[PDB]
DNA sequence: TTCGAC
DNA sequence: GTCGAA
């Protein structure tokens, strides 16, 4: 595996230094198209040296690493570190014409982050930072990582997985639900390309456990309608679902409704009437240690598999993969199992939250990031959640 | 809320 | 919590 970046260039995975060097040389896979060529930096430390250094590093690295040229950074200063004062400056910024907001908070402050973050996600791409955490020693690493996620939030594509276009799924739908407490949950469905790029994402409102199966179906239907409306010629002959999340235990009823949903989409010509599909459950399992391997595919039964990833003692991060439903022929079966497992391994190398791979499939990881926000926006009574469907606002 | 491992 | 990363 390699990552594809700008200008047809590919760099090795598992190597941050070469990835950044690569970006500087060849640019990211896609430079975001900006409307204003302007970003706001909002903070409360007008004379702070660390803020000056932060701003200077953001300017240089946006230009040199990201090949986003001639961008202007405008500063906005809030006086009091509370919601209404910070909001007024967010408003002055939005009124001036900016592509994104980089907002420095005084410290870790959970209710204030969720109230503001929730308000920004509904308005404009944004990247938060904590004033109290900045340091001279960490600032380069800090800014390089932050820009991965901020460029992505602006609609850029830092890098994609180089995969063989003849193998794997036409689309992968990561779906399931996440309980936010003992009673309430939200369903999610996110469509990905085999190269790890998110094409479209839908999340349900917060609902009770009793409404889970109905909203699971409607959420998946909505995400495909939206993918297909925006990608009318994107045929899907090979479809995989990756089901995850802490959700109600209702396996057979859930599998039944997911096959119905695939059948309905077939009827509506959203996917091929001869689509080959599998429904998979993906579950993180307990780590183990090899006492003194990687991307290894383990068969437990005809339908249960593990994929092991690197995590004296070698720590291993295991992922359980169960094929709960498929319409594969028994002759293609073995071939298809290799293909879905290799695809899960490729997707586990895609993470636009930072340079370092999470070694967890993006189809599982990005829904976890959404969960964190939807759950805490609810708990701290923030603002409930089209640029949203196609952009990774949750990074 | 840099992220993510210890 | 605390710290190290190309
Ligand atoms: Mn983030």
Residue numbers in the entry: 11 to 302, 311 to 329, 339 to 412, 418 to 427
Please give me the paper's original passages concerning this structure.
AfPiwi is a model PIWI/MID domain protein, corresponding to the “PIWI lobe” of a full-length Argonaute protein (Parker et al., 2004; Song et al., 2004; Yuan et al., 2005). We show, using isothermal titration calorimetry (ITC), that association with a PIWI/MID domain protein (AfPiwi from Archaeoglobus fulgidus) greatly enhances the affinity of the seed-target interaction. Thus, association of the guide strand with the PIWI/MID domain generates an enhanced affinity anchor site over the seed that can promote fidelity in target recognition and stabilize and guide the assembly of the active silencing complex.
The structure superimposes closely with the RNA complex (Parker et al., 2005; Ma et al., 2005), with the guide strand anchored to AfPiwi via its 5′ phosphate group and the phosphodiester backbone of the seed region. At the 5′ end, the nucleic acid duplex is distorted such that the G1 and T1 bases are unwound with G1 being displaced into the conserved 5′ binding pocket. The interactions between conserved residues in AfPiwi and the phosphodiester backbone of the seed region of the guide are identical or similar in most cases to those in the RNA complex. Furthermore, the crystal structures of the AfPiwi RNA/RNA and DNA/DNA complexes show that in both cases target nucleotides T2 to T8 make no contacts to the protein, interacting with the complex through base pairing to the guide only.
